[PDB]
Write a protein that binds this ligand. Structure first.
Ligand SMILES: [Zn+2]
Lengths: 179, 649, 629
């Protein structure tokens, strides 16, 4: 229950919302998909499996409608742990949320915000991350301490953490207007 | 270290004898070493482009490099004379040619693809060889066929020229990111060709994927294109129970082994190990019986075509021709059995070569000559990109926007010089185009070339005065349309700073372009772009439940290498520090439960899978069980083999 | 215009007013044009971004610009959400940007670190950046080569700086070369920032144009090191833009290759260090007892000299003559120059873990998370980053050398060369003066006395000296004087303007202080023969000059686990005396510990299981990592 992907900047969304490619989310959350299809379509599991096989070779629309409803009605929203090889710094592994699915079939890049990039101490040079989903509802509450919300305060001193602040060009943009 | 004192700059004057792989990159005495050393690797990893163009600012050194690289073009060593040509397929055919100075014989084979490596290749632009027919004469300098890089007149080219500007677009260019217009994406392209080896045994059969029962087309035709990314699927057949298994062959079953590939199939070849009498009756093995026969026909042709040449008294043949003749005469004989991997296979095995064009997609990388590496982030329709709507030449639109933040911080001022040169070229070209007859037009050009590279002026004058009126007018129109080429050498002989200062001072009518909705002066130039090998689909991987290792832990499976699946179903391992960083939180039982139920305990894994599949999909409330894990048993067995045991309390 | 901010903050039309203002500024900015005069003055640009409007809070008047007003409403969201009026106490000047981090930290502690206020602040960051993106598109930021050229004509002082070559008619040491570059680079930043130009906004914000890196593009480079750190004695005399020469090209190639070798080597050995510390310092735990009961005489004593050390001791107790266990005051500077008694975890008493008093007032902040694991990640990560990023800075500093009175009066040293004033004076050297060189095996005469005719003054050269190659050829037979047991070197034989003695110098590596920190833990050079009161005092001195910003509590916990108590009972600290203790290397501290799970998973599998040097059979202490086994 794991996958690897790349990084691509994404704008116009809250700081803890990411958008995953169509292919990877259609296979990581594979078993739960068959459960949703079975009840609505009124067929057994063997017949539903061959339907999912055809819905992953080429982009379609019937599967996508069931896909969108899954990330809206479920409790807490589908989440996963994202880390970076290697991890040597605090916050190199986070606990994010899913809020968007890319329509394109040829797109194979993970879209994250720009502010969250500095926490991983990485860049868009072409590194490969590891994605691990979490399933159990009771287990989620124990992992919530690793969310970026809990890393807002600096453990070193007790002040506002400088990593989760304006960096790179965003510093320059404010200065032009502020002055 | 005082050994530097031997180096003296007196002798190293006006000669580039100390540069390797840097001859292509211009103004090499401006950028630092750390960025320059990346250019070598960038040139080492550069895929082929369909619409290759010669660079606008050339270093006058790539032509000889292209000539001395013999891996892309094939010319005639000596004057030949066509003897015969024979066909083998719809496209591929061979021809036998004879010398006029030694009497030897050689062969030339026309193709449609080339397998550079496991994934990347190119397509031959074979045009001259096709026009050759019916006992013509081949000269010394003629080129039979060439790659897509080389142009009509042997001029090299390994990239494209794109309008570029330095700009910031909604912070989408943070770090190293690039936006690109749709027209530039259409201009940029790439090729891809791959070979797939399918296998068939006596028990196995091929499903009727294409066509109805009248034409049991197991596999696509010679020139058709594949559909649904499935080339062929074979189903095992058992003697005991087949009544309820072969009822309908037009649909996939539960236990199938399909093969995945994408593109257009160009070349096939089939090798068989079964007697033809047994193969003549099987109805489902129909299409193969076609192609094999056709193949054999071709071989017979050669045995009846040039049998008078080699078997004759002359026998003056090259090694390649003799080897090919023996290989082709092997097949038509009797009682021959092939072998594969030093083993005798039972059923026949074929070959497929598939060609496909892959357009530019999000996530790819494109770099310039000076190693300003970037990554494509978001493509836009050409309307959104900035345009100039105030100057005389309203309409010019930038195609790529680069990061302006990291230009001085990266310590490489060559890009600014190149952009300024191309901008001054644009201005002088428009000024020449505005007015002026052919009598003085060239003068307006020459002045500009006088202050950039003094060596080029003499050749300019010689070439201009060499031609006649009509060709001169055509050349002037062409330079008006495309643009004035500017030449300058990498190390010795180029513009520095004082020359740029003087050039700016002399032209006083030049101002920055005023864009629309920007309120900041801007300059747009033309820069050289080369694609790179790195792609997102070559490393993307996902895994739900693949084959397990012998011990019980998940492990890498070799199925993607044989084109049996789409994704490289390889799990990602948790490292030494990953567990500790997870244990940063005071909770440990949750970590243990996750690890045990994910990749340690078989019963826990099965229980989790069942509880996830059946139940409530919206809300999950799984409850793991308590069963001794496999790793504990392995460790206990190993330690009791050593002679020690772990005791609690 | 005058908007009552107290009314607007609680008007309940927060979305309507903020959206309307956020649109008028952008709409107007995309119509006019910007003009640049490049002179000392500023062009009379007209913009809505800079207009004066009076802001009123509680009746007071605070004259602020329109551009600052919009940034105020965006950053003052939490007051509206909690329905609390805003007062002038939280107001701060918005002209600068580093003041923003002081505003956020004055918001968290004001609302008591509530879980609700964390969500609201997380919303402000998202909204502030999104509206920041729109300004960049409408205004535009460009880098152009013509910007520098145009500035040259208007400002005369810039033309001289662009074409500047090091004079070669005067002798200059390697210390004077660094002075010239810094002198010229400092003047560049004054002219560019003060006067209007394209790059004015690039420098004032200080985000994108590093001061040292940008100097190399315009001014001369200077000197570069080599594969073995020795300074190459051929300074580059031409800037990057002005061009390079073949001899200069070779020197540049050496610097680039060193980066690849260092980067590749560090990648191969990167996680080796962090594994050792993480495995040991993991079992610590926090109890909620108010005070353990440690005797006052066992409190750690520290010495404070610089104000920086005071910054390392924040929110921790200290002992006073009249006050007991009072909180320390960072702002008060009366504590400097004197020693203090700071309770510390190294002398904690509870057998389970540190209490509230010993740890300090940071207990609330890090109550939920583990305490041990924060310390190890807070230290290793900055250490590795500095070993990479700082080492990438090839340019290195130089140190002054005191040659001596007689050395200066007779030899004016130019780079790696020596020249005498008068060639008549000879030199007398004894046979025993020559010594074998460590590397080149050549003769090096560190000390000698010149034979200045009848007069003579001894020379104490601080650095090693290499004899001239030309003069050594005749030394074998002619200048060889074994009869008097003293070589005679007549400088009159040497021609005028010729080399006499070449000396090599090693630069002061910036990574040298960082390495000694690693050597302290393992090498046992200093840690063996000292007590705890000296090591932590020594430990702080290493971090002070290194530049790492780490609180004292997250650095001392390493010492707590490094030290081992023979009695194996922390309650012994309740008595007056200090029980005997021995410090160990971090590798041997874990092996000779008392746990079993940590020992098997660390290293040396054969040694622990075959023999009993570490006595593996008598380690039964529980651990949090035993669940894996
Ligand atoms: Zn205590």
């Amino acid at each position: 229950f794991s996958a690897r992907n790349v990084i691509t900047p994404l704008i116009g969304h809250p700081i803890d919302e990411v958008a995953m490619p169509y292919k990877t989310f259609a296979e990581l959350y594979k078993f739960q998909l068959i459960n949703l299809i079975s009840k609505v379509k009124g067929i057994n599991y063997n017949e539903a499996l061959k339907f999912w096989e055809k819905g992953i070779l080429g982009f379609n629309q019937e599967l996508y409608n069931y896909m969108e409803e899954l990330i809206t009605k479920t409790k807490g929203g589908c989440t996963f742990l994202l880390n970076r090889n290697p991890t040597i710094s605090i916050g190199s592994i986070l606990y994010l949320k899913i809020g968007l699915i890319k329509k394109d079939y040829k797109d194979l890049t993970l879209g994250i915000s720009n502010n969250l990039l500095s926490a991983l101490s990485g860049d868009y040079d072409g590194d490969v991350l590891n994605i691990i989903p979490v399933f159990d509802n009771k287990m989620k509450e124990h992992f919530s301490l690793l969310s970026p919300q809990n890393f807002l305060v600096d453990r070193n001193n007790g002040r506002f953490n400088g990593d989760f602040d304006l960096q790179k060009d965003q510093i320059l943009g404010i200065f032009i207007l502020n002055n | 270290m005082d050994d530097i004192s031997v180096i003296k700059n007196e002798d190293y004057e006006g000669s580039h004898r100390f540069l390797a792989e840097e001859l292509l990159m211009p103004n090499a005495n401006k950028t630092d070493g750390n960025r320059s050393t990346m250019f070598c690797s960038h040139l080492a990893q550069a895929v082929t482009l369909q619409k290759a163009e010669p660079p606008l600012v050339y270093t006058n050194f790539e032509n000889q490099v292209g000539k001395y690289s013999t891996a892309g073009y094939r010319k005639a060593n000596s004057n030949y004379k066509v003897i015969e040509k024979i066909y083998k397929n719809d496209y591929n055919y061979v021809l036998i040619v004879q010398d006029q100075e030694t009497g030897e014989y050689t062969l030339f084979e026309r193709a449609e693809c080339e397998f550079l490596t496991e994934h990347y290749g190119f397509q031959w632009d074979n045009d001259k060889i096709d026009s050759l027919k019916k006992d013509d004469t081949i000269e010394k300098d003629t080129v039979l066929y060439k790659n897509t890089c080389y142009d009509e007149n042997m001029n090299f080219g390994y990239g494209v020229n794109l309008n570029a500007a330095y700009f910031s677009y909604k912070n989408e260019t943070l770090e190293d990111a690039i936006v690109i217009s749709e027209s530039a994406a259409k201009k940029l392209g790439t090729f891809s060709v791959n070979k797939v080896k399918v296998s068939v045994n006596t028990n196995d059969i091929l499903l009727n994927l294409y066509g109805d029962n009248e034409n049991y087309k197991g596999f696509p035709d010679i020139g058709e294109h594949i559909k649904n990314q499935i080339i062929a699927s074979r189903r095992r057949f058992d003697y005991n129970t087949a009544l309820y298994e072969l009822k309908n062959l037009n649909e996939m079953r539960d236990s199938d082994t399909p093969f995945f590939a994408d593109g257009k199939i160009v070349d096939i070849e089939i090798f068989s190990n079964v007697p033809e009498e047994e193969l003549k009756v099987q109805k489902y093995n129909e299409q193969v019986l076609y192609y094999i026969n056709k193949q054999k026909e071709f071989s017979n042709n050669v045995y009846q075509k040039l049998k008078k040449i080699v078997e004759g008294k002359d026998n003056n043949v090259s090694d390649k021709l003799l080897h090919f003749y023996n290989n082709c005469k092997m097949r038509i004989d009797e009682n021959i059995s092939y072998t594969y991997q030093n083993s005798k296979f039972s059923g026949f095995i074929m070959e497929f070569t598939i060609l496909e064009e892959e357009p530019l997609n999000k996530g790819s990388k494109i770099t310039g000559r000076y190693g300003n590496k970037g990554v494509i982030s978001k493509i836009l329709p050409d309307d959104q990109m900035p345009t100039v709507a105030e100057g005389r030449f309203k309409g010019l639109k930038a195609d790529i926007c680069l990061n302006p933040l990291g230009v001085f911080n990266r310590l490489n001022p060559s890009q600014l010089i190149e952009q300024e040169l191309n901008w001054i070229a644009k201005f002088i070209r428009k000024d020449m185009e505005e007015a002026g007859s052919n009598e003085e037009k060239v003068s307006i050009l020459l002045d500009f070339l006088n202050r950039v590279n003094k060596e080029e002026t003499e050749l300019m004058e010689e070439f201009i005065n060499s031609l006649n009126k009509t060709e001169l007018e055509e050349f002037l129109n062409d330079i008006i349309e495309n643009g004035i080429p500017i030449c300058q050498k990498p190390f010795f002989g180029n513009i520095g700073l004082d020359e740029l200062w003087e050039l700016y001072n002399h032209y006083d009518h030049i101002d920055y372009f005023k864009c629309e909705g920007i309120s900041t002066p801007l300059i747009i130039g033309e820069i050289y772009m080369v694609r790179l090998k790195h792609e997102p689909h070559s490393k993307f991987s996902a895994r739900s439940t693949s084959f397990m290792n012998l011990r019980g832990l998940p492990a890498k499976s070799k199925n993607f290498k044989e084109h049996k699946d789409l994704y490289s179903k390889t799990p990602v391992r948790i490292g030494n520090m990953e567990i500790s960083n997870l244990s940063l939180t005071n909770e440990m039982g949750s970590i243990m439960d996750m690890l045990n139920s994910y990749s340690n305990n078989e019963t826990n894994r099965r229980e989790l899978i069942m509880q996830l599949l059946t139940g409530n999909p919206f809300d999950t409330n799984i409850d793991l069980s308590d069963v001794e894990s496999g790793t504990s048993k392995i460790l206990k067995s190993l330690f009791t083999c050593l002679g020690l045991s772990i005791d609690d309390v | 215009k005058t908007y009552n901010l107290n009314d607007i903050l609680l008007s309940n039309e927060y979305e309507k007013i903020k959206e309307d203002i956020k649109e008028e500024i952008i709409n107007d900015m995309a119509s006019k044009k910007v003009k640049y005069s490049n002179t000392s003055e500023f062009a009379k640009n007209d913009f809505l971004k800079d207009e004066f409007i009076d802001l009123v809070v509680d009746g007071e008047t605070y004259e602020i610009t329109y551009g600052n007003l919009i940034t105020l409403l965006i950053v003052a969201r939490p007051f509206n959400h909690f329905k609390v009026p805003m007062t002038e106490d939280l107001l701060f000047d918005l002209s600068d940007l580093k003041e923003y981090q002081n505003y956020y930290t004055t918001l968290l502690e004001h609302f008591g670190y509530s879980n609700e206020i964390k969500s609201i602040i997380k919303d402000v960051i998202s909204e502030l950046a999104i509206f920041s993106g729109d300004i960049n598109v409408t205004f535009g930021n460009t880098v152009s080569i013509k910007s520098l050229i145009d500035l040259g004509n208007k400002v005369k002082r810039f033309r001289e700086l662009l074409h500047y070559r090091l004079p070669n008619d005067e002798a200059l040491e390697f210390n004077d070369i660094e002075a010239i570059i810094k002198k010229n680079l400092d003047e560049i930043m004054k002219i560019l920032s003060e006067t209007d130009n394209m790059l004015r906004y690039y420098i004032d914000s200080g985000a994108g144009i590093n001061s040292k890196q940008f100097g190399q593009v315009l001014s001369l480079v200077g000197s570069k090191p080599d594969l073995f750190g020795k300074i190459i004695p051929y300074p580059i005399n031409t800037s990057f833009l002005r061009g390079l020469d073949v001899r200069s090209f070779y020197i540049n190639a050496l610097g680039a290759r060193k980066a690849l070798i260092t980067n590749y080597q560090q990648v191969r050995n990167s996680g080796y260090l962090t594994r050792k510390i993480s495995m040991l310092l993991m079992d610590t735990k926090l109890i909620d007892l108010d005070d353990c009961g440690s005797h006052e005489n066992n409190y750690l004593s520290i010495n404070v000299e610089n104000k920086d050390v005071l910054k390392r001791f924040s929110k921790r107790s200290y002992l006073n003559n009249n006050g007991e266990l009072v909180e320390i005051d960072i702002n008060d500077e009366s504590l400097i120059g004197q020693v203090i008694k700071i309770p510390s975890p190294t002398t904690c008493a509870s057998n389970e873990g540190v209490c509230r008093k010993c740890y300090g007032k940071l207990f609330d902040i890090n109550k939920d998370l583990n305490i041990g694991m924060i310390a190890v990640l807070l230290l290793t990560d900055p250490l590795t980053q500095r070993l990479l990023s700082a080492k990438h800075l090839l340019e290195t500093r130089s140190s002054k050398i005191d040659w001596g009175t007689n050395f200066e009066e007779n030899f004016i040293v130019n780079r790696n060369l020596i020249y005498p004033k008068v060639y008549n004076g000879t030199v007398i050297i004894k046979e025993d003066d020559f010594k074998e060189d460590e590397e080149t095996e050549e003769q090096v005469f560190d000390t000698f006395t010149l034979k200045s005719g009848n007069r003579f003054i001894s020379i104490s050269s601080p650095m090693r000296l290499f004899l001239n190659k030309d003069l050594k050829k005749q030394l074998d037979e002619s200048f060889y004087n074994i009869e008097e047991m003293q070589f005679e070197i007549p400088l009159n034989k040497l021609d005028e303007g010729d080399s006499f003695a070449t000396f090599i110098m090693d630069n002061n590596e910036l990574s040298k202080p960082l390495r000694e920190i690693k050597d302290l833990i393992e090498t046992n050079k200093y840690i063996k023969d000292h007590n705890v009161n000296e090591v932590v005092n020594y430990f702080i001195y290493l971090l002070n000059e290194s530049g790492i910003n780490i609180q004292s509590v997250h650095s001392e916990l390493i010492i707590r686990e490094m030290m081992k108590l023979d009695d194996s009972d922390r309650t012994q600290f309740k008595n007056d005396k200090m029980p005997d203790y021995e410090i160990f290397r971090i590798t041997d501290a874990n092996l000779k510990g008392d746990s079993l799970s940590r020992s098997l998973l660390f290293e040396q599998v054969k040694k622990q299981l075959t023999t009993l040097d570490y006595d593996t059979f008598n380690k039964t202490k529980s651990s949090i990592l035993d669940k894996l086994l």
